[PDB]
Each structure stands twice: as structure tokens, then as C-alpha cells.
Amino acid sequence: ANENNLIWIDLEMTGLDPERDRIIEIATLVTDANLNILAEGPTIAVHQSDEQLALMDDWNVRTHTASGLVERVKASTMGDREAELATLEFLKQWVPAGKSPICGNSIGQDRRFLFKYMPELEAYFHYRYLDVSTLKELARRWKPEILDGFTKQGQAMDDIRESVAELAYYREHFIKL
Amino acid sequence: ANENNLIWIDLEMTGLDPERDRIIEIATLVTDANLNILAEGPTIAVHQSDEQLALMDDWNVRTHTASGLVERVKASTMGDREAELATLEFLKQWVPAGKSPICGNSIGQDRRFLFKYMPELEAYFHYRYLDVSTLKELARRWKPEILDGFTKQAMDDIRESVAELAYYREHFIKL
Ligand SMILES: [Mg+2]
Ligand SMILES: [Mg+2]
Ligand code: NA
């Protein structure tokens, strides 16, 4: 455990509305304060009912079926609470409660789903947000030149590792240390 | 009107839980892409019931009573919907729909209340977030030296947030 470590997280959901939609995937990963990847946490397909999956709009059915996530959700024996507790069992080994901001890309949406469906995991984070896309937005406005230099190869944890590498790029090319 | 303008916003709430708590203040302000303040929007006390105000924990009762916001809430004839529409009437003059990220300090909480209580104003923002406190967090971890150089009413908070982002632009970003 170290109080400067960062919790990175990436959810998949059935849609964008926490009131109607559910979490169907959680992945976590911990870095040190300098973005050295310490440990990859468990990628868990979160079981939801056939009823709930049938409410998915066409974009979500297409994406989550093609990826194999829909199959893994149907087969999963872990609901919201089991996935929450397994994620906490992983994070407790690496980061104390209330210290890491929520880190990732478009993490405001993810935190909304944590508040509704995994409030204990939500509480484990510092109140603050580290959305890498905050730096992409500023870069696009103040220094667009640097955006040509970074590329994504287009898997939850591939997205997290890409988010870490993206923050590291902004640390070298956008920040002044 | 200009596609590169930024919407800055600060809500006050009765508490932290959108399921139980309500918006009691909205303030907005628009900057250009380089943080030049173009216009201060309306600061509106959002009417909520005496029942709802009575659910406030000690921190919220102390803060919102002392500021005079509780008096203004009781006197207000603008609910969620009227405050939403008045805010949109101001923002339409300055920024097209779907262009500005939500800008401010600890703004994820505010957006949660927009989703529940002002979904039309929420939709007016780009899906993205510009939380200045994201840069404060990185600064604290990567360059704490610069935090001693900067030191800190809804709109005072927003103007302070703009000045804070401007500080990080000079002392933390490399242009
Ligand atoms: Mg994502
Ligand atoms: Mg505030
Ligand atoms: Na928290």
C-alpha cells in the first residue's frame, strides 16, 4: 500500500443512463504517482438479466455482442455486489481508501454508475477526478500540434493501459516539470 | 456566439446525493478558448420546499444560512425548470449547443445534479469535463512547488477557478 498510487478504472454499461442501464464490465489497474503500472486488477463481466440486456439500443447490442461481452455477462455468476467486493479486494492491496482520484478516460460517466450500483467502491476513491481527456481537451485548444504524435490501436484493459500511456505523453509534451 | 467559448458553472446543493438532495443555486460564466471572461451569467437561488431545506446536514445549514442563500431560496419563485431555462437563455447568446465541456472546480458532482434535475442544460454541454482540480491533483503529485504561488459566493468561486486554470496555463503547461 502507498498513498500516492493511482486507481485507473474502465466500466462497460448497457447504455448511458444509470437510472435504466447497468454495469456489465469492470476493469481496474494501479500505477504509482509517476504512471509506472504496479498491477492489473481483475476484468469482470458483471451478470445482468436477459430482460436488462434486451433493453440495450442497437449500438450497445452490436458492440457488446461482437466483443464477446454479452456471452460473458450471461455466463457470469458475479452481480454488481460481487464485482464491487472483488475489485475492492484487489485495490486494498495497493492503495489506501480516500487517496486516489478516479483515473481513466471519460470517467465522469463511470463514477455515475459507481454511485448508483457500487457505492462502496465509489467511496474508496478520493472525491476528485483525473480524466486524461481533460488534458486532451486543453491540448486541442492550446497546443493541437502534440495530438498528431499520439495514436491508439483501437478490450477494457488495453483501453486503460492506452489511457495511462496518453497521460504519460501529456506529461512529456504538454506539462512543464 | 463562437464554437470555442467555454461554459463555467457552479451549483450549490442541499447535500451530495442527487437521489435525496436538490439544487439551491446555479451560477454560470462564459470565457473564450483563452480564458478571457466574456460575460457573467445569472446567479439564481433555486426555490426548494422548507421540507427539503430541513434535510440539510449541519455543514450545509451553516454554509447556506451564513451566505444568505437559504433566505434567497425561500423567497425564490424559480424552481429547477425556471432556473434551467434562464441559464439556457444566457448560454444561447455565447456558445452553441454540444460544444463546451462543463468547466469549473469539482464539476463531476455538479453534472450529476444537472443530469437528474436540469437534463436540458446538461445536454447543452459537450460530454467532456474540464475540471481545473484535475490539474491541481497532477501539480500536487508532479510539481507541488507551484501550489504555494496560488491562494484562494458562487461567482467568486467560478472567477477563482478561471484564474486557477490560467495559473496552471502559465506555470504547469508548456506552450
Ligand atoms: Mg470507457
Ligand atoms: Mg461550489
Ligand atoms: Na469518494
Residue numbers in the entry:
A (entry chain D): 3 to 156, 159 to 181
B (entry chain C): 3 to 154, 159 to 181
Copy text verbatim from the article accompanying this structure deposition.
Removal of pGpG is critical for c-di-GMP homeostasis, as excess uncleaved pGpG can have feedback inhibition on phosphodiesterases, thereby perturbing cellular signaling pathways regulated by c-di-GMP. Removal of pGpG is important to maintain the pool of free nucleotides inside the cell and to prevent mispriming of transcripts and is brought about by Orns.
In order to obtain better understanding of the additional C-terminal helix, α10, in Ms_orn, the structure of Orn of Escherichia coli (Eco_orn) with the canonical Rnase-H fold was also determined for comparative structural analysis. The final structure of Eco_orn could be traced from residues 2 to 181 of the polypeptide chain. Eco_orn was also identified as a dimer by gel filtration, SEC–MALLS and PISA. Superposition of Eco_orn structure over Ms_orn indicates overall structural similarity with rmsd of 1.134 Å across 347 Cα-atoms of the dimer but lacking the C-terminal tail of Ms_orn. Eco_orn, on the other hand, buries only 17.2% of total solvent-accessible area comprising nearly 1650 Å2 in the dimer interface. Interestingly, estimated Tm (50 °C) of Eco_orn (which naturally lacks the C-terminal extended region) was similar to that of Ms_ornΔC, suggesting α10 aids the higher observed thermostability of Ms_orn (under mild denaturing conditions). The denaturation curve of Eco_orn shows a monophasic manner of transition from folded to unfolded state, whereas both mycobacterial proteins exhibit a biphasic transition.
